[PDB]
Paper text:
Human cytomegalovirus (HCMV), a ubiquitous beta-herpesvirus causing serious disease in immunocompromised individuals, encodes an abundant immediate-early protein termed IE1 that modulates innate immune mechanisms as well as other cellular processes. In addition to its effects on the innate immune system, IE1 is required to overcome the PML-NB-mediated intrinsic immunity that targets HCMV immediately upon infection. We present the first crystal structure for the evolutionary conserved core domain (IE1CORE) of primate cytomegalovirus IE1, which exhibits a novel, unusual fold.
Crystallization trials with full-length hIE1 remained unsuccessful and, in case of the IE1CORE variants, yielded suitable crystals only for rhIE1CORE after chemical methylation of surface exposed lysine residues. The structure of rhIE1CORE was solved using experimental phases and refined to 2.3 Å resolution (Rwork = 19.73%, Rfree = 24.96%). RhIE1CORE adopts an elongated, femur-like shape with dimensions of 130×25×25 Å3. The structure can be divided into three distinct regions, namely an N-terminal head region (rhIE1: residues 62–118, 236–283; hIE1 residues 46–103, 221–267) and a C-terminal head region (rhIE1 residues 151–207, 315–393; hIE1 residues 136–192, 300–380) interconnected by a stalk region (rhIE1 residues 41–61, 119–150, 208–235, 284–314; hIE1 residues 27–45, 104–135, 193–220, 268–299). The stalk consists of an uncommon right-handed three-helix coiled-coil (α-helices H3, H6 and H9) with the N-terminal helix H1 added to one side of the three-helix bundle. RhIE1CORE forms a dimer with C2 point group symmetry in the crystal, and oligomerization of rhIE1 and hIE1 was confirmed both by gel filtration experiments and co-immunoprecipitation analyses (hIE1). RhIE1CORE dimerizes with both stalk regions juxtaposed in an antiparallel fashion. The main-chain conformation differs in the two monomers (Cα-RMSD for all helical segments  = 2.13 Å). This deviation originates from a pronounced kink that is observed in one of the two monomers and that causes a repositioning of the loop that interconnects helices H8 to H9 with a concomitant displacement of the N-terminal half of helix H9.
Author numbering:
A (entry chain A): 40 to 392
B (entry chain B): 41 to 73, 77 to 342, 344 to 393
The structure:
Amino acid sequence: KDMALQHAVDLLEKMLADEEKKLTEFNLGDPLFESANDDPIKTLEEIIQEGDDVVGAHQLVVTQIKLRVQRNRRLADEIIREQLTDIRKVFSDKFEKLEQGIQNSYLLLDKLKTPFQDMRCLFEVANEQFNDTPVPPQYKEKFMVCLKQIVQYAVNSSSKLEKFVMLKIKTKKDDIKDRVTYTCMKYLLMAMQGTGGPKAINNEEHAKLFFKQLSNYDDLTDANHDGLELIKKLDKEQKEVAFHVNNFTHLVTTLGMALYKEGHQKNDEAMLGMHTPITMLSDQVRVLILYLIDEIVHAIHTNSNQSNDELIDGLKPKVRIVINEFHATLMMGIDKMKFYSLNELREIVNDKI
Amino acid sequence: DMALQHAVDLLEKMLADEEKKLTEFNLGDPLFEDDPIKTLEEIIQEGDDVVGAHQLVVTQIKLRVQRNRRLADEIIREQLTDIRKVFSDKFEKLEQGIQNSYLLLDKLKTPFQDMRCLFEVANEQFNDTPVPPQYKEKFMVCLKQIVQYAVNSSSKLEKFVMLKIKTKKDDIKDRVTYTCMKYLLMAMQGTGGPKAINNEEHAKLFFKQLSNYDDLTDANHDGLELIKKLDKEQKEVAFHVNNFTHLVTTLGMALYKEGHQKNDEAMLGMHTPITMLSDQVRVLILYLIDEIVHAIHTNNQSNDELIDGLKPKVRIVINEFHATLMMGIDKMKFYSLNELREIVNDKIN
């Protein structure tokens, strides 16, 4: 589909669905039937007030433990299920925010190409340098005529510089989308890896052992005593549940937070990454105009015999060479910011010729 | 000993080297001496003397080009300190981040030193396990012992856990120190300025063609244009300072956010393993309780017989934890008491 992070969103769905399925499965040791006993849970007070005799107390204590083990396991199961619900909530919200932010980064990145559209900046920089270049008056018109034509030739020959900018921009767009997607998937795995709460619950095991040794109690006042103490503990906070709730909440929150940042992070990686190439090419454009201007005035001075056409013509290969040189340099993607001097351009041109 | 010590070194190294190549901003004392640079206003009042004004014009151009060069360097000189201030601050903050994390990883392993936690869980589960008072003694005797065995039989498990926290401490210093350098370069690889200067190129052309001006007033006029532009340049130094400040700040934040994000990812990587290991310890204990009670409540055996019987089951379980822990988090799990039985049964045969 058309979401930048569509793969992340798909994987979130699949994992939750699979996990939600594993919750209802039957695993070894599970009873054939879970107990859903109707009768209401009575408070410790009520049990104390109703247990006149040691045998009536026992009846009351056993059943009230069983009702409570039932209640506690249900709430524990609910909490296991809410882990998945919480993962859906936190990661859906983070993906939506991340997606809205990737879309903005796309725009931002595309704004970087406008000066280079049809390499229109050559015209604008030529306009400026033409106004600021001093030229003895008797040379101005020829300077003008020849500069116009060779700048226009330069525009027509610099298609690869514009196509480079567009390639780089597209690369950063795809970088952002791939990197954020990978991070999204990574955090999602780490989240699903933390699910599953506790399985064994202390007080439930204690009840299981209690009910095992019910026959081995010589004195029913003793059996009642342990039973009542087990009731108190079954109404207290389940420590292992508390431990795992706080741990899982720390895990998902932190994953959540580490991800909210992520899009602004890859956004900035992209904009920072465009800094050197755009800056180098902007400088190259300027330096090209300056080199063309010096060549032209030097030719005008030193070779008044040849026509405008023959002057312009001798410059065309020099134009092609510099543009080629600029392009190879930018393609190298060094990220070491390199600028050219005119003297550097002349040596490169004087070599190829 | 600072964990990010190499980052800091490389910071002072690079700044220093870059600073060497800069030219001094203030001119020394002239052999023959007052400010040599004269205002636009002053140069204008010279203009009745065309030859006089011409000579003053070419001189003031050449002085302004050298002035503007010195400014260019004064720009970088103000930059390298912005790099220093930003990146010192972030290196310090990141370093504090690492030292904190060092303490948190130490915290994580403390329960497992000498596997002390096995005693603590045993205490709590003991106190809470219901048992007839005429068997309470048999329960206590058999539990204290077999838990002590479990502690003694877990030394290879323990040493592995410590090693994994040790390895993770080393991995944090290395990842964050990478992030620090990668971003130091960008602040460096992206400092300086262009080689070809517009006004300098214009000036060079002017002088190239000065002899072809038939009429000095044309030359004088062009020269004054050049001087105005050279002065506009000198007045744009702040703009390039600010722009590079914005740039370094952004590099600094992305530096901080990445070092931090890397730090937190390594800690979270330990979190769930540690959460499962602590649960596995608790389930082991509950499993030992259950065994003992089953073997006491039903089946004419002694404590030694019972306890002897439990030792192979213990080591099987601890080995199971150890083995899954080595395979990694994908092979690690929370256990039911009956999955321990399952495992213990499966291995014996």
